[PDB]
Every structure is written in C-alpha cells, then in structure tokens.
Design a binder for this molecule. Structure first.
Ligand SMILES: Nc1ncnc2c1ncn2[C@@H]1O[C@H](COP(=O)(O)OP(=O)(O)O)[C@@H](O)[C@H]1O
Lengths: 427, 52
C-alpha cells in the first residue's frame, strides 16, 4: 500500500504503439524518441526470447533518461519475466569472486517454470468425525452444487488434526501429497459464539465442482536452483548470500537437466533482462569474463547504462570509450540518449509534478524550466518537492514563482556550491 | 431265521408330481429372490469399529 514515489516511479512503461512507434509523452516517458524506439525493439526481441546473450549499451549525458528508459522497459516487461537491476559496484564482494557474482547475476534472470496438473479437492467441511480405538473416521465436504462423504485414513486424520481444521471451514486437499490448506471461514463457520471467540471473518463457500483438476505453476530461477542444489543447506537464497558454487557438475548438471526438461516439455525457458547501471565500475576481469559469459546459451539479455566517455578502464591504465574495453564493446549495440530541449524539460517537469501531486502555476513551470535548462534537470525536479513544502507551510493551493525562487535561493546546486567554495574549506 | 425286512410307500404320480415340482418352483424363486435382496440390503460390504 505505502511504497513511496521514487525518482523513477513516474514512468509506467515505454510510450510505444503496436508498431514500436514512440509517442511524445505517453505512459510517463517524454521525448527521447530514438532511444525509446531502440528500447522498444530490444524489448520486443526480449518478449520473443529465442536468442540468448545479447548486450545493449545505453550511453548518454548525465540525467537524460537512461535509467528512466531502463525502468520503463522493466515496467513494460512486467512480471513473469526476470528483470534484475544491479549497480556496477554491487559485484565487488568479499566472500565471492567478481566472476562468480556475475554468473549469479546472469543466472538470476533466467526463469524455469514447471507446470503441473495436480488434482485437489476443494469444499467446505461440514463434519469431521473420528473415533480413536489406529483411529478411523469420516468427513463431509460440501460445495454450493453438491455434498459428498469421505472415509479418512490414518495419515489423513493426522494431517487434519495437525492443521486443526473444523466444520464450516473451506479447505483444499492435495490428493497427491495430502497437503491441507484452509482458505478461510465460511458463513457456517460461525462457532455459535458462547465462549472466548474473537474471529468472525466469513467468506462465500467454494463454487463449481467438488473434485476439480486445476493447474499449478512453480517458477524458480536457475540461480535459486543451483543455490539450493549446492549443499544440504537449501535456504541460502534467504538465509544469507554465502555462495561460491563450484563450476563442477552442479551448474553443468543444472544446465543439462533444464535442457532435458525443455526437450521433454516439463519447463522450457523464460529469458530475462539484466540492467547494469553504472557499468564503468566493473573491472577488467569482469569485462574479460563477460566477453565469454555472453556466449552461453543460458545467457539472458543485458542492458548497461553509461555516463563516462573516453576514460581509463578500472583496474588498468587503458583509455577506452565508455570506460569499457573494445573487446566487450564490440558485442554491444550502442544507443545514445540525447539531451532534452526546452519543451522536453518542461514536459518532464510537468509530468513529475503531476505524479508527486503538486499543482504549479504557468509561470512556475516557466521559471522551473529556466532553472532546469540553466542547471541540471535533476536539480529542477528536486526543486518541486521543496517548493511545495513552503506553499503548504504558508497555506497555499498551487506552487507559485516566489516559492520556487525562495527554494532556489535556499538550496544550492553543484555549480553554485563550487563557486561559493572560495575558501580553503579543508581541502 | 426269526427276523425279516420290510418296505412300503410305493407311490409316484407323474402328472401330480409335475404339478408338485411346478409348485416347488415358487419356493425356489422365493428363496433365490430373498437371498439376493437380503444380501444386497444387509451386507453392503464394509467393516466396523474396534472394542477397546
Ligand atoms: N522522456 C522523459 N519523460 C519524463 N521524465 C523524464 C524523461 N527523461 C528524463 N526524465 C526525468 O528526469 C529525471 C532524471 O533523469 P534520468 O532519467 O535519471 O536521466 P539520467 O539517467 O541520464 O540521469 C528522472 O526522474 C526522470 O523522471
């Protein structure tokens, strides 16, 4: 319910048409037509998912919507498709190597979905009789269409008593494994309150047939598979990130078995996306490993954000564009994001201030676009929230130009901070 | 040479015997139907509880 609106919470997806034609200001995104169209093409290739290990590099100026396009792709791709966002500095771990962390990041965006047809029994328990001498009993299950009786076995009675199911309770019984799951209390579940009862949350009885055959789906990532198969401690996915799976049969066996599963139709594949933000943090070893890690058939697609230009590669003294060696840069398809014009900055500010629920005047928009064209669009955006607070403090309705000017004089951007740093300031 | 055997009841009437067995057919059918229905309505194969 309460998940605040972050910097990228305004974009709900790429504003594209059926033919991947980017609209001006649809679905949160504004301008940046060429890069948005490239993002849409790669997103369509992703949703297709018959090619593995493809890399894209979204380069551009700082604050031009690269991470914005990434979050838009994530949203347009939605669930049921792994999307893993990672900063370049997150792989520098102390307990696992950089190559192992990259293998984890890759295998974490590859989904394996086992589809099963386990039949169950869903109904509202009417009576649960049981006589202890091995104890034996019966159960009366009712649905809105029919009622039936069942003779309960030893382990059936054991599980029913352990789960403590009673009459009026709506439950589901996995006939294959005998797993019980109570979904709620039916109107009949009324206990004729005359004792210490504090629950009266009723619900409609189950409809349809008594013994129906529904379909379950178990979706887990190759990362989780190899983690739970590494050692008897099958909880490292939640327990802790202590890892280091040897590349011996364990991972090769995961791959071989997933191949057989795909062949026999148990669970085939669902590729994913890996958004590496600020990839310039990766080391020369990281790039050299990626060079061949992108060549694996189980390699999901990756999109790497870039602000740097002609700069040295980390871990060495080689000057290379994007801070990435040409060896890896050759596999990538480079998309350049252009700076936003006046009408693009203004529309972005408008959408942001309408998303964060702040009404600005027509002159407020003008002065804010001026400030955002003279300074960073990020500073202009951050000015909106600060300007709304002075208005609320003075009991206003919509942000005026005087509030934005007060906020501009009160807070400093990087340029004015540097120009004010005229003293030693403990260099 | 004191004792001796005896025998009597030499009677068997063809048509009257046919009638008698055609009548016994009634008892036979009654027994069959009674056994069948009683079995089907009483056995209803199942088990009972223990006496501890
Ligand atoms: N085309 C656009 N439409 C709407 N908002 C945008 C657009 N481009 C950038 N923004 C906004 O600008 C802010 C910062 O820009 P960002 O997307 O982070 O660019 P960069 O990643 O280059 O800094 C974000 O909060 C984003 O909402």
């Amino acid at each position: 319910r309460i998940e605040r609106i972050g910097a990228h919470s305004h974009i709900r997806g790429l504003g594209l048409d059926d033919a991947l034609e980017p609209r001006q200001a649809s679905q949160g995104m504004v301008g940046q037509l060429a890069a948005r169209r490239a993002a849409g093409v790669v997103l369509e290739m992703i949703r297709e998912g018959k090619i593995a290990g493809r890399a894209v590099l979204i380069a551009g100026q700082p604050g031009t919507g690269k991470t914005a396009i990434a979050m838009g792709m994530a949203q347009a791709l939605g669930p049921d498709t792994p999307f893993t966002a990672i900063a370049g500095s997150e792989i520098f771990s102390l307990e696992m190597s950089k190559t192992e962390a990259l293998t984890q990041a890759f295998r974490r965006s590859i989904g394996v979905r086992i589809k099963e047809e386990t039949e169950i029994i869903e109904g509202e328990v009417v009576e649960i009789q049981i006589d202890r001498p091995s104890k034996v009993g019966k159960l009366t299950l009712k649905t809105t269409e029919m009622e039936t009786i069942y003779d309960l076995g030893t382990k059936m009675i054991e599980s029913l008593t352990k789960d403590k199911v009673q009459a009026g309770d709506v439950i589901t019984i996995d006939k294959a494994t005998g797993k019980i799951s109570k979904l709620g209390r039916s109107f009949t579940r009324a206990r004729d309150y005359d004792a210490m009862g504090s629950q009266t949350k009723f619900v409609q009885c189950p409809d349809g047939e008594l013994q129906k055959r529904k379909e379950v789906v178990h979706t887990v990532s190759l990362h989780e598979i190899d983690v739970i198969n590494s050692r008897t401690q099958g909880f490292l996915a939640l327990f802790s990130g202590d890892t280091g799976e040897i590349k011996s049969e364990v991972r090769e066996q995961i791959n071989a078995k997933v191949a057989e599963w795909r062949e026999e139709g148990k669970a085939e594949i669902i590729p994913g996306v890996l958004f590496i933000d600020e990839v310039h943090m990766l080391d020369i070893e990281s790039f050299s490993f990626l060079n061949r890690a992108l060549e694996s058939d189980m390699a999901p697609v990756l999109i790497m954000a870039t602000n740097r230009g002609i700069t040295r590669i980390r871990g060495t003294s080689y000057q290379s564009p994007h801070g990435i060696p040409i060896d890896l840069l050759d596999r990538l398809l480079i998309v350049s994001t252009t700076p936003y014009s006046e009408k693009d900055t203004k529309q972005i500010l408008r959408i942001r201030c309408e998303e964060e629920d702040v009404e600005m005047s027509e002159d407020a928009y003008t002065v804010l676009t001026r400030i955002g064209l003279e300074t960073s669009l990020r500073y202009a955006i951050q000015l909106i929230t600060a300007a709304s607070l002075v208005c609320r403090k003075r009991k206003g309705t919509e942000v005026q130009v005087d509030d934005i000017k007060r906020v501009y004089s009160l807070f400093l951007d990087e340029s004015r901070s540097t120009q004010y740093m005229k003293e030693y300031q403990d260099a | 040479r004191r004792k001796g055997p005896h025998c009597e009841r030499p009677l068997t009437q063809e048509e009257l015997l046919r009638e008698a067995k055609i009548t016994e057919e009634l008892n036979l059918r009654s027994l069959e139907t009674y056994e069948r229905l009683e079995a089907d309505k009483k056995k209803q194969v199942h088990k009972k509880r223990k006496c501890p």
